[PDB]
Amino acid sequence: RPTLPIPDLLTTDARNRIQLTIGAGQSTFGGKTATTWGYNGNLLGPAVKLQRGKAVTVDIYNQLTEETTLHWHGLEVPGEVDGGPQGIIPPGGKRSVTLNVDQPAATCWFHPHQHGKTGRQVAMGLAGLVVIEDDEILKLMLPKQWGIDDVPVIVQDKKFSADGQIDYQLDVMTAAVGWFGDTLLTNGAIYPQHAAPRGWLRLRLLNGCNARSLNFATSDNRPLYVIASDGGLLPEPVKVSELPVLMGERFEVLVEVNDNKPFDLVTLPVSQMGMAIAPFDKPHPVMRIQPIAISASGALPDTLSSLPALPSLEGLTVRKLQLSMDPMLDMMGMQMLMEKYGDQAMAGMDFHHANKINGQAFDMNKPMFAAAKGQYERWVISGVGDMMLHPFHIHGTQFRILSENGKPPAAHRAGWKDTVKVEGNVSEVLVKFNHDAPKEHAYMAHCHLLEHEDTGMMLGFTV
Ligand SMILES: [Cu+2]
Ligand SMILES: [Cu+2]
Ligand SMILES: [Cu+2]
Ligand SMILES: [Cu+2]
């Protein structure tokens, strides 16, 4: 097996700058070459390393021949640097942003957010990581050797055409159920191996799929200890036997590594339209972990961090967000899915503006509302009326889930999140915005099933 590719951990240079170049190159998948896009490379991207309270400048060079934007998913930053659909970087051009991180240590990530083209640009290869550090997390003595016992694991599916090229399409079927494929990539590689020292292995998991939800487990049923969610550390580790991860979500886990016993990280079949078609009808290997005997000091602390109590709900502004899909899209998309793949596609169960929030497909010129600044609000997001999975993402914030699709959140999902599951039921989140976002650079709130976002299921809001 190939070794697990390790993204460069990229810090500021002598001028306090970080350079990202967006460009097209070539990658090889199963011995077939494909045109791919990457940040500072042919595919995916580096891990940008930030320190809480230390402002840096990021220079972003777009060397594609089309427009793109660079969104920092999970970062609590002003709208002006948020890199949403309004943050256009011309082909051949450059945009610079100041990032002054004012949030706890976390694994965030970045990716394009081009209006109606986000699914395609991510599918082509564009994604990178953000590693935020603070004073607190370094005192913990977690596994911290980047690429050795602290490793990023970006998991993505793709589909390829016979000629080996990435086979992306935004059509009525994918607008309904998402773009998904039959080939699983792990930091861009197919079923790589990672050699990890005996002791604790820290995995920073990112579901970077367009539309496929994942569910991580180990091949020999050793548990995963969740230590962080989207927005950082949990108050204490949460032991799980399997770990569902929605599109765009991150979790950090520790897993035990003992000699003479390699094991796989796998993903388990999920109950999501279309996502259990072979080879995903059975547990699917993600990567092989090979124990080695080199230095490792990491530990699993009893206590990780301190999370504030939920604020009182009384008096809080309530914002209602009704997600919906045009009945025609729902009908025709599910029909095409069924026709193409048959019964297995439901195992466990103008389209360009057919997906909507509050009866409106995304209008970049009209933010739906102005949220308060520095005040908690309660946002209620409903997927009642269709059966699709909507990982709902809100820019500019790390929030607390109050209720997730009809139940209180699981322990490992009760900390800082920027995504919440909405699937045929209703979710509630407690959100606060610490930074400005004017109409010209509004925040987005949207489904992170990228084909839904690209066909309308997004709103803008100001702070
Ligand atoms: Cu995102
Ligand atoms: Cu985001
Ligand atoms: Cu959706
Ligand atoms: Cu977004």
List the domains of the chain with CATH numbers: 1-144 (2.60.40.420), 145-296 (2.60.40.420), 315-463 (2.60.40.420)
Distance 220 CA to ligand 1 centre (A): 32
Distance 293 CA to ligand 3 centre (A): 45
Distance 150 CA to ligand 4 centre (A): 27
Please give the Cα distance from 172 to 296 (Å, whole number). 50
Distance 444 CA to ligand 3 centre (A): 14
Resolution in A: 1.8
Distance 233 CA to ligand 3 centre (A): 27
Matching residue, tokens 């839904």: 452
115 annotated as ligand-binding = no
412 annotated as ligand-binding = no
Distance 302 CA to ligand 1 centre (A): 31
Please give the Cα distance from 244 to 242 (Å, whole number). 7
* 109 contacts 103 by C-beta, under 8 angstroms: no
Q: Which amino acid is at 6?
A: I
Please give the Cα distance from 15 to 296 (Å, whole number). 33
Kindly tell me the burial class for residue 57, based on how many C-beta atoms sit within 10 Å of its own C-beta (0-12, 13-18, 19 or more): middle
Burial 182-191 (b: 16+ CB within 10 A, else e): eebbbbbbeb
Please give the Cα distance from 299 to 140 (Å, whole number). 8
Residues 6+ apart with CB under 8 A from 422: 323, 381, 382, 383, 389, 390, 391, 392, 405, 447
113 annotated as ligand-binding = yes
Distance 407 CA to ligand 1 centre (A): 24
Distance 447 CA to ligand 2 centre (A): 10
* 200 contacts 10 by C-beta, under 8 angstroms: no
Residues 6+ apart with CB under 8 A from 339: none
Distance 127 CA to ligand 1 centre (A): 9
The closest of 24, 33, 22 to 87, measured between CA atoms, is 22
441 annotated as ligand-binding = no
Please give the Cα distance from 281 to 456 (Å, whole number). 30
Question: Residue 72 CA: which ligand is closest?
Answer: 2
The half-sphere exposure of 241 on its side-chain side, counting CA atoms within 13 A, is 2
C-alpha distances out from residue 348 to 49, 273, 390, 413, 422, Å: 40, 8, 17, 23, 17
C-alpha distances out from residue 282 to 179, 215, 271, 390, Å: 20, 12, 12, 23
> DSSP character for 332?
H
How are strands ordered across the β-sheet holding 443-447?
369-370, 458-462, 443-447, 390-394, 419-422
Spacing of C-alpha 172 from chain mean position: 24
First-to-last alpha carbon distance for the chain, in angstroms, is 49
Total residues found in the chain within this entry: 463
Kindly tell me the burial class for residue 145, based on how many C-beta atoms sit within 10 Å of its own C-beta (0-12, 13-18, 19 or more): middle
Residue 104 — φ and ψ, nearest 5°? -65, 160
Tokens coding 115? 């209006």
452 annotated as ligand-binding = yes
Please give the Cα distance from 38 to 22 (Å, whole number). 6
Question: Residue 109 CA: which ligand is closest?
Answer: 1
284 annotated as ligand-binding = no
Q: Is 411 helix (H, G, I), strand (E, B) or coil?
A: helix
Distance 342 CA to ligand 2 centre (A): 34
